[PDB]
Design an enzyme around this catalytic site. Structure first.
Site, PDB file in Angstrom:
ATOM      1  N   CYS A   9       0.706  -1.203  -0.144  1.00 17.41           N
ATOM      2  CA  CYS A   9      -0.225  -0.159  -0.064  1.00 17.41           C
ATOM      3  C   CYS A   9       1.090   1.244  -0.051  1.00 17.41           C
ATOM      4  O   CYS A   9       1.943   1.118  -0.264  1.00 17.41           O
ATOM      5  CB  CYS A   9      -1.027  -0.149   1.039  1.00 17.41           C
ATOM      6  SG  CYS A   9      -0.582   0.232   2.916  1.00 17.41           S
ATOM      7  N   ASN A  12       2.292   1.458   4.035  1.00 18.90           N
ATOM      8  CA  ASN A  12       2.459   0.156   4.921  1.00 18.90           C
ATOM      9  C   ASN A  12       2.000   0.204   6.260  1.00 18.90           C
ATOM     10  O   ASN A  12       2.643  -0.144   7.351  1.00 18.90           O
ATOM     11  CB  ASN A  12       3.691  -0.197   4.536  1.00 18.90           C
ATOM     12  CG  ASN A  12       3.903  -1.697   5.239  1.00 18.90           C
ATOM     13  OD1 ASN A  12       5.140  -2.005   5.657  1.00 18.90           O
ATOM     14  ND2 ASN A  12       3.205  -2.799   5.034  1.00 18.90           N
ATOM     15  N   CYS A  14      -1.837   1.043   7.056  1.00  8.31           N
ATOM     16  CA  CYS A  14      -3.244   0.840   7.475  1.00  8.31           C
ATOM     17  C   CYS A  14      -3.486  -0.398   6.703  1.00  8.31           C
ATOM     18  O   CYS A  14      -3.791  -1.619   7.172  1.00  8.31           O
ATOM     19  CB  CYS A  14      -4.227   1.749   6.841  1.00  8.31           C
ATOM     20  SG  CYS A  14      -3.809   3.347   8.027  1.00  8.31           S
ATOM     21  N   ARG A  15      -3.415  -0.481   5.182  1.00  9.48           N
ATOM     22  CA  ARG A  15      -3.959  -1.515   4.477  1.00  9.48           C
ATOM     23  C   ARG A  15      -3.331  -2.861   4.287  1.00  9.48           C
ATOM     24  O   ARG A  15      -3.731  -3.794   4.435  1.00  9.48           O
ATOM     25  CB  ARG A  15      -4.437  -1.068   2.919  1.00  9.48           C
ATOM     26  CG  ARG A  15      -5.482  -0.038   3.065  1.00  9.48           C
ATOM     27  CD  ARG A  15      -5.676   0.643   1.790  1.00  9.48           C
ATOM     28  NE  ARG A  15      -4.607   1.751   1.474  1.00  9.48           N
ATOM     29  CZ  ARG A  15      -4.139   2.601   0.340  1.00  9.48           C
ATOM     30  NH1 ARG A  15      -5.107   1.994  -0.816  1.00  9.48           N
ATOM     31  NH2 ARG A  15      -3.171   3.199   0.466  1.00  9.48           N
ATOM     32  N   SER A  16      -1.867  -2.565   3.645  1.00  3.73           N
ATOM     33  CA  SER A  16      -1.365  -3.744   3.654  1.00  3.73           C
ATOM     34  C   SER A  16      -1.005  -4.560   4.816  1.00  3.73           C
ATOM     35  O   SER A  16      -0.686  -5.760   4.846  1.00  3.73           O
ATOM     36  CB  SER A  16       0.016  -3.367   2.789  1.00  3.73           C
ATOM     37  OG  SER A  16       0.991  -2.617   3.167  1.00  3.73           O
ATOM     38  N   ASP A 126      -7.768   3.581   0.791  1.00  7.11           N
ATOM     39  CA  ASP A 126      -6.881   4.360   1.838  1.00  7.11           C
ATOM     40  C   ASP A 126      -7.905   4.803   2.783  1.00  7.11           C
ATOM     41  O   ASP A 126      -8.744   5.694   2.655  1.00  7.11           O
ATOM     42  CB  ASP A 126      -6.060   5.389   1.402  1.00  7.11           C
ATOM     43  CG  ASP A 126      -5.240   5.956   2.477  1.00  7.11           C
ATOM     44  OD1 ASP A 126      -5.492   5.625   3.750  1.00  7.11           O
ATOM     45  OD2 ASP A 126      -4.326   6.742   2.248  1.00  7.11           O
TER      46      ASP A 126
END
Length: 154
Positions: A9, A12, A14-16, A126
Site C-alpha cells: 500500500c 504500509n 493501514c491496508r497492507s 486508503d
C-alpha cells in the site's frame, strides 16, 4: 513448492499490514504456512519503522489477529524475491509497475488484490482519513480477496 506474496500500500501502516495478517491467518488455518513466505511493504517514505495504525491493530484484534509488522519500503530486491506483489489501489499499481522497470530480473506478478474479489470491489481504498468502519471494510475486502487468491494459486 514454496510460494511468496508481498502486500503493498502507500504507507504500509493501514491496508497492507491488514492484508498481510489476513493472509497469514488463512494459510495458518489451512496448515500450509510452511509453504508460504508472506510480507508487506510501502511505496512511499511516509511511515518507515512505524507500527500499524491503531485502527488497524484494533480491527485485526476484533477478528482475533495480531501483527508484529513494522513499516518498510518496497525495494528493487522485492521484485525478484516475490512471486506476487498484490497492491491496494491504482496509484499503488502505477507506482509499482514504474519501479519494476528499473529491475532487470523482475519476476513478480504485480496485481491489485481486489482483482481477486468475487464481489468485484477492485479498489481497496486508503482508510486513513476515514473512520473505524473504513478499516473494517478493508479487512472484509482483504478476507474475500485473500481467500480467492489462495483458492487460485494454492
Amino acid at each position: 513448492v514454496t510460494k511468496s506474496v508481498l502486500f503493498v500500500c502507500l504507507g504500509n501502516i493501514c491496508r497492507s499490514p491488514i492484508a498481510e495478517a489476513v493472509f497469514r491467518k488463512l494459510v495458518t488455518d489451512q496448515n500450509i504456512s510452511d509453504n508460504w513466505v508472506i510480507d508487506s511493504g510501502a511505496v512511499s517514505d511516509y511511515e518507515v519503522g512505524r507500527s500499524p495504525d491503531p485502527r488497524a491493530v484494533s480491527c485485526l484484534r476484533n477478528h482475533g489477529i495480531n501483527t508484529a509488522h513494522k513499516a518498510r519500503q518496497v525495494t528493487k530486491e522485492d521484485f525478484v524475491t516475490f512471486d506476487y506483489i498484490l497492491c491496494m489501489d491504482e496509484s499503488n499499481l502505477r507506482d509499482l509497475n514504474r519501479k519494476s522497470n528499473q529491475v532487470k530480473n523482475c519476476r513478480a506478478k504485480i496485481e491489485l488484490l481486489g482483482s481477486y474479489d468475487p464481489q468485484k470491489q477492485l479498489i481497496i481504498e486508503d482508510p486513513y482519513y476515514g473512520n473505524d468502519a473504513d478499516f473494517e471494510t478493508v479487512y472484509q475486502q482483504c478476507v474475500r480477496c485473500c481467500r480467492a487468491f489462495l483458492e487460485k494459486v494454492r
